[PDB]
Amino acid sequence: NTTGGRFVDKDNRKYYVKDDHKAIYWHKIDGKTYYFGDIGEMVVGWQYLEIPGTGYRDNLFDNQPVNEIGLQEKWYYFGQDGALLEQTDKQVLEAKTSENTGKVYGEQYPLSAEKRTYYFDNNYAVKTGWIYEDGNWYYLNKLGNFGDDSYNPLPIGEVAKGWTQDFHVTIDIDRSKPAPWYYLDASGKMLTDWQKVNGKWYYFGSSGSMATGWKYVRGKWYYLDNKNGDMKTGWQYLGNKWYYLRSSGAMVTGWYQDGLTWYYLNAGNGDMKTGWFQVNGKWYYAYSSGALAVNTTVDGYSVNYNGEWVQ
Numbered sequence: 001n002t003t004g005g006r007f008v009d010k011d012n013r014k015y016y017v018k019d020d021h022k023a024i025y026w027h028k029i030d031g032k033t034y035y036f037g038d039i040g041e042m043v044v045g046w047q048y049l050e051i052p053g054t055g056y057r058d059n060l061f062d063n064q065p066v067n068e069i070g071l072q073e074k075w076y077y078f079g080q081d082g083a084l085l086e087q088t089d090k091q092v093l094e095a096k097t098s099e100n101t102g103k104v105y106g107e108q109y110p111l112s113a114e115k116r117t118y119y120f121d122n123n124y125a126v127k128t129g130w131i132y133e134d135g136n137w138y139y140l141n142k143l144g145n146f147g148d149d150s151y152n153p154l155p156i157g158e159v160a161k162g163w164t165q166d167f168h169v170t171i172d173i174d175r176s177k178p179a180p181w182y183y184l185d186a187s188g189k190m191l192t193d194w195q196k197v198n199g200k201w202y203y204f205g206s207s208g209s210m211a212t213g214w215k216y217v218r219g220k221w222y223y224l225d226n227k228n229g230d231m232k233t234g235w236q237y238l239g240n241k242w243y244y245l246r247s248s249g250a251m252v253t254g255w256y257q258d259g260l261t262w263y264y265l266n267a268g269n270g271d272m273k274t275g276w277f278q279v280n281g282k283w284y285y286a287y288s289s290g291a292l293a294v295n296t297t298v299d300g301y302s303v304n305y306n307g308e309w310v311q
């Protein structure tokens with residue numbers, strides 16, 4: 001809905017001039033969309049820009065006041081003629097790098113030899129977050145890289161690999177909502193269920209989020225590191241109680257012999273018993289270590305080689 005002007009080539013740049021004024025920011029001109037920056041120079045290729053459509057960065061010329069406004073920035077792709085690529089699905093394009101973005105018409109730069117598939121949202125920006133493609137989940141980076149002032153938006157929209165936190169994010173991370181961990185393999189596919197990574201087991205479940213703490217999977221209990229997710233084995237002191245986890249990770253219940261020493265792990269909860277306890281109508285005594293007293297006396301009461309109380 002911008003009309004009555006014309007494109008002008010001047011000083012190795014391209015402008016759109018109407019009634020003697022230069023177009024700035026976003027314009028829809030004769031069925032195509034262009035962006036002319038803060039002083040009129042038409043952009044080409046990859047651009048990280050304030051979102052169009054509100055009116056505050058739209059249909060504006062450089063003789064008009066430019067409002068203060070807070071708008072998220074997103075990645076957009078423009079042709080070499082300045083026309084916005086109005087894609088809402090996906091398209092293979094030159095990879096955005098440090099040397100092919102923020103360019104204007106008239107500027108020379110190398111087209112990336114590397115091409116990648118970029119995904120787009122319904123408003124022609126590069127899509128971020130979770131997408132489902134041909135039977136798998138992929139994560140498109142919502143965030144760029146930080147480095148003490150050094151924000152680089154380049155990784156946004158790119159396929160994530162490896163260990164990745166899914167933050168709630170608009171302009172910035174919302175550090176009040178949860179940010180679960182995921183693991184994407186070498187092609188970006190989200191892993192589920194049990195996976196061994198850097199020598200340790202993790203459980204990602206059906207939804208892909210990395211489990212922490214206690215988790216019941218296929219009829220057995222496992223303990224994943226409360227912070228780091230890695231699966232524990234052996235004896236573990238958790239919540240002021242000992243538990244014994246097999247080499248497979250599965251929690252033990254009932255009687256368990258470590259070397260010569262017997263321990264009793266509570267039938268349901270799995271916690272190691274100490275003191276006097278009953279099992280199937282028999283009395284047994286475990287020391288503070290968990291070790292079953294056998295062939296000896298305890299507070300006047302004697303116990304046989306099975307550890308059972310004898311009258």
Ligand SMILES: C[N+](C)(C)CCO
Nearest residue numbers: 130137190207208209
């Ligand atoms: C990761 N999923 C998209 C599979 C679900 C959680 O948002």
Ligand SMILES: C[N+](C)(C)CCO
Nearest residue numbers: 163164181227228229
């Ligand atoms: C959960 N991670 C393994 C990704 C981080 C460990 O600190």
Ligand SMILES: C[N+](C)(C)CCO
Nearest residue numbers: 194201231247248249
């Ligand atoms: C041994 N795990 C149970 C940890 C995974 C493979 O079955």
Ligand SMILES: C[N+](C)(C)CCO
Nearest residue numbers: 214221251268269270
């Ligand atoms: C039963 N466990 C203690 C093993 C898990 C949390 O209740």
Ligand SMILES: C[N+](C)(C)CCO
Nearest residue numbers: 276277283284301309
């Ligand atoms: C069961 N004993 C009688 C052995 C001790 C009391 O708990």
Ligand SMILES: C[N+](C)(C)CCO
Nearest residue numbers: 235242258272289290
């Ligand atoms: C770990 N415990 C203290 C339960 C016994 C030593 O194996």
Ligand SMILES: C[N+](C)(C)CCO
Nearest residue numbers: 255262292305306307
């Ligand atoms: C003999 N115990 C009762 C100690 C355990 C194995 O049966």
